[model samples]
Target chain A: EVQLVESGGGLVQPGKSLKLSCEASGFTFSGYGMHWVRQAPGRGLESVAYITSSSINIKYADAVKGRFTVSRDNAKNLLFLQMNILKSEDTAMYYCARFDWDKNYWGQGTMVTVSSAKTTAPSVYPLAPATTNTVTLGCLVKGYFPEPVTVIWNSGALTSGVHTFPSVLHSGLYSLSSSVTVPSSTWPSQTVTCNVAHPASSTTVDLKIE
Target chain B: DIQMTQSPSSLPASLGDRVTINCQASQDISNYLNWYQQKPGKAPKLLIYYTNKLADGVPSRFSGSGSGRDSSFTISSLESEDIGSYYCQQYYNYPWTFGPGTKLEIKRADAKPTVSIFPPSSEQLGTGSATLVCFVNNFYPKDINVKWKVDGSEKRDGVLQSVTDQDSKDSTYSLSSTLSLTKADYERHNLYTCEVTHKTSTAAIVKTLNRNE
Candidate 1:
């Protein structure tokens, strides 16, 4: 049986360096190639770089061509990756795979967060699109690091039909939208607030009825 | 929002054969399309994104290409592992949409459906209307047509109901169709026939029941 053990993952602030390791067993590390791939939360796999078994050929994706370094120790059957100038976009699960016609042997990856210990607060804006009787109110959360924010309504009353879409990535920052449907009767009588609870800070935006 | 449509809801292909599945967006998505492959009981894995860019670790045999509303997904040489469902999704705008999945089946040229018909009891029909059921079993590639007939004239009853498919224990498919007829029709009609037409078999299978009164 073949096995690949990986190590080295932690939270580092931006502008720092990150390193990962892959130890190979039951296979010749010098006879085969190793590839580095990363996957963000809820996103697809992305190719980062690959080094041939003999360390003769090294290929890097355009996105991280100069920022990534790949090397291995043939005697120890070890693979290594050192990423430079870490940014929020580099926060993802870094996996090391033994390259073949396809990647059948994949290492259990490590999550690398590019920022922590400080606040990269998010900006919130309320959007109430005009409609008929049951109007819909939306909240836009822009520019945040580290995800899975909590959404609340008016300290918690308007809970029906509240839909929050998954976060979208833009320039390494995360943005998302959430909508809540409320009746015209409830709008004038009651106030609706879209409160976002993120790791950085808790922000609230009020929905003004038209 | 852009709508996505995929063709060939079901595909039958053999090993080493080239297979193509198509997806058409309601509007141009400018390479925002992604293709995914999902095996039974497993999470879907992305194969291609940005119209034709292969995902990491994805084999080169699986290729995608497109420019506008229409995107093409092709398997250069279908492999056994490629036997699964494929989907196309577009993220061009808000509210991403995925097209109906296209199931790719390994060609089983020898499998044919064994059909059985259970006709309404003559005594039960002698009193009132009764239901006749036809069971289609152990078929491959699932596309089948079942027709019912009275005397020599083809009957249209139950044609509105589609011949739905269910997986069997042997990895084959089964479906049932029912027909209703009254005692008066049993006396007026000489015979009731259940005919099944499947692409797997060279000839259609027909079962007949004669009037008892």
Candidate 2:
């Protein structure tokens, strides 16, 4: 018989760190391995990390890579997960499970929400030099935390001509800009749109090349 | 990852009925299977693990048995409180997976709680302190919450005990709570209320009282 209980999850601000604990009882804790599982709201479960109780071996999910660390205290029958440089996307329910080949026992999940005080939507504009031959559209998404974002340009079909500039970091915030060039012949009579995908929500800006 | 599947996604049963849910694993998992019960809005609770071993404090009526790749959970006699979703998990592979959940449902039984309040005796009331007992009986779906209120405000320090008697003919559950009050409560004419909330009831069952010798 074995039991695992999870604790230490609540609201955390972006760019901060959080550590969760799971206490094991009713059986020899070192007899089995422990793993972390997380589920974002309205999404399927994801395996976050795994740690062997008998040794110091650990494996993390590719999505979390260097941002998450899993460890255990064999003597105290306690397992821990330290998540650093968190983002709003990390707001999810986390569970600790006893892992052999698969998870045999699971602790109750703890819900964590990374609070974002302010979310900025991107600004879209047609770049200068709106010549009769070609034109370039620019989008600026700034003052957001949790770095990575996906920006796309669509006009009749999903296009990938958009290239993003490296993110600018300041005061725990990130800013990014992306641009796409369209030939003047194909730019008229079509609704060109820029879409920015962030963990919090998606923003869209449309332009009719007149 | 070993894939698991459960059939008959949901079932409706009644008291004294036998209910069984079946789970199948994609590959041979041996005895590395477990069953869990999850009530709405609550965490899943492990009922059986390692094929057939029941968890501590789980009733005997709920049992699990299976062999490699196949498992079954059975409830000898369905209880009202047993209405909830159940899932089976397999730990035989790297990425463990759970079966699609099966929901057990019991028809809404006309088991509105019979609430009663007992006031302190004359001698006990004379001691400037008294214990008021609130009893709620014959409620179906044992998931009921009990609360005590003094003069419209929630009060604390109440001892509650719940029980489901298997020997009795009826299969419903009952509970009682005792609240300690001071003589000042009577002097001020404070109203004591016992409120019981259950999923089956649209409104809370409330019984209020003043000092009664």
Candidate 3:
């Protein structure tokens, strides 16, 4: 007695949360739980979660450890998913799935691609003693067919941190990169690592502080 | 509990983006996919049933095509107004199932998402006697019920009536029942209504028009 219709597409940035809606018609919703499933660019599918009834079980899938939530607006017979902590790895097609055992039903698929980082050149600025400077961790992934993998930063220093985000090279393979920055004034020589990883191979580079 | 998964979770498109939704059955179902469309604040409209047949008054661009375990439905030129969710249903077996849904955000393709509602059509009237017509053609797979409400009162026996499926190609079906009211009968205060009930879905539809002509 119910039918599911979905929304179009989406473009989102990593580290932020995104949500989509799935609406059902036909039967009057009396409290059926809604479900979510995932598919990668060129991979099989995986179960995400099943929001059982509005007041009961809140089931979850494997890869979705934290910050992902599902809910429904029964009066409108709508189900929703809130995905958080966006990462290059989180990019994939998400769908609303359901079944009454005797039969299985599905919504059209929704494609999700993370937005690319704005700045990608490597840099190192000196900081004075007792002062802190902010450095952006990123990679320049231009001029390549499909996308290449690269590590942005990895080394020993105060306030060294790392992050990975996805960007589309002109070729369209959905490349990925990571970034990490350290505080200056450690005049002690230190090395930061940027590893570029690809399907068949990987590259790593280290930057030293003088 | 069978599962469904969709890809390209989102996309930006123009007003006429040909939207498509695929449904993979956990197993095989012959020809049991149905589609629906819905707008905010209104009831959902049945777009296609029994796979690709269009529902009453639906635009031609809405079509469904697929077979076996994998099936797909498409909206040729996504209208700016065609923004809404799309779902698939399997009725080939017992415990009919439905897909979760796909949200369509007008031209934005990423916002203003909406879902399509199922069970969009229903029987509107029942048990009065006048003239009855199918709400949607080729939808009813069985005989429907049509009876007369005598004089705005209960249907009593011993009333003069003619029953014939007139104009029906099948002869037995086109036959209809007509009750004539002369000037004397109209002036004599005779008022009536038509009542109908469908057999397939067992739903009812009623129509009450003034016979004061």
Candidate 4:
């Protein structure tokens, strides 16, 4: 009857800032304490820290000696774990749990790979186009680290259809592409902007139909 | 760190019958216990975690209940497809431990047996000869194969094995095999392995009595 959904974990560069979340359900948020735990290969498991059901008493274990900021949002039924200066020693599976003894409910662990390297910015490629009564345009994004990236259309105009594709890892970097189809007559009169964001940097490119 | 063990290594059940497996932890792991189902030849899949919550898409019939040092995993109505090994794990401490495993079955064998191999006593090794014993239990179909190996090749010259014993209360099988060798061969640092391939699956379970371990 309980579930803890965890998110925001993947490759995090050493010393980088990473914030993870746990969405608690099937029970009351204020009725029990909540905690975070982690384990790395060959290293023993560690109980990071927890917040009391009262939300006033927060306790940190010896494992939290390295660093962790455990916080919660009672109204949202959420718990957060924020970490900066994440080192190789911190690479492990991180889990959030509910507590009386801090063991009742647990999230499927978020595997934070702090052992991996830094993020890299993505390439802002020009739009690829096609014609009909409407037009299909494409934005190809590539070569970025930390895998996850955000690609958006900043045309300030509405479109009929839009599609975003997932990132593909190549040579240790990630690549992505997205597209939007618009009314054919507007193509010659409008300029479309592609805005891409990644852990490393954000890039924007403007394209006008030639 | 905590230790975990499961009871009734061989579970006997019939269609539509309610069945339960028990887990006992050496320490109080509380509700940090989890249950898993391992389909034959496949990896273990989480069935229930945090004591009683079913994993996404896990069937409603499977449930769990536990607190402190003891817990249980239950299949409300046993079906033929539920015939697999069930295990319990505790995540309350540093070293998470799992079950020795409990096999669920009807009377039709084919459940793969658990295999264990241990080299003879250190005292016996001093008497000019050494012995390596391989023990396997809780399987069916009576077509299990146990073999002894020296540096990777099957060397059965000095090995003796017994017929499968159906003495288990749950109607499964158990047996042991022993391989003999001269102290000269054992001291020479020659590698050894005990391989057991049960009739239930194509995969062979092997263990090397690592001298260092």
Give per-residue CA lDDT, model 3, range B86-176, as digits (tens). 6666657433455666656433111110101011011111211121111111112224455556456645332222221111221122112
How would you order the candidates by lDDT, starting with the best? Answer: 1, 2, 4, 3
- Per-prediction CA RMSD (Å): 23.1, 28.1, 33.4, 20.5
Q: What C-alpha lDDT values do all the predictions have? A: 0.70, 0.69, 0.49, 0.68
- Please give the lDDT score at residue A142 for candidate 3: 25
- Candidate 2 per-residue C-alpha lDDT over B25-62 given as tens digits, one digit per residue, 9 for 90 to 100: 99898798878887644556788888888787789998
State what share of the real interface contacts each candidate retains: 0.00, 0.05, 0.00, 0.00
TM-score of chain B taken alone, every candidate = 0.66, 0.54, 0.45, 0.55
Q: At residue B10, give the lDDT of candidate 3.
A: 35
Model 2: runs farther than 4 Å from truth?
A: A1-5, A12-17, A23-32, A38-48, A59-67, A74-77, A84-91, A97-109, A114-210, B107-213
Give candidate 1 misplaced runs (Cα > 4 Å).
A1-16, A23-32, A38-46, A53-57, A61-67, A73-78, A85-93, A107-118, A123-131, A140-143, A152-160, A166-175, A186-195, A200-210, B1-213
Residue-level lDDT of model 2, residues A105-198, one tens digit each, is: 7887888767754455543333222123655554545456553467666743645433445554443455555545567576655556666666
TM-score of chain B of 3: 0.45
Per-residue lDDT tens digits for candidate 1, residues A56-168, read 98878677778889999999989999999887788788888764432246777878877644445676655543134665555655557766577777767766645555555
Range of the 10 consecutive residues with the lowest summed lDDT in candidate 4 chain B? B162-171
Off by over 4 Å in 4: A1-5, A14-17, A23-28, A37-48, A59-65, A75-77, A84-93, A99-109, A117-210, B1-22, B27-213
Model with the higher lDDT, candidate 1 or 4? 1
i-RMS values of the candidates, in order? 22.2, 29.2, 31.8, 24.7
Best by DockQ, which number?
Answer: 2
Top TM-score prediction, candidate number: 2
Considering only N, C-alpha and C atoms within 3 Å, which residue pairs clash in candidate 1?
Answer: none
Residue pairs with colliding backbones in model 2 are none
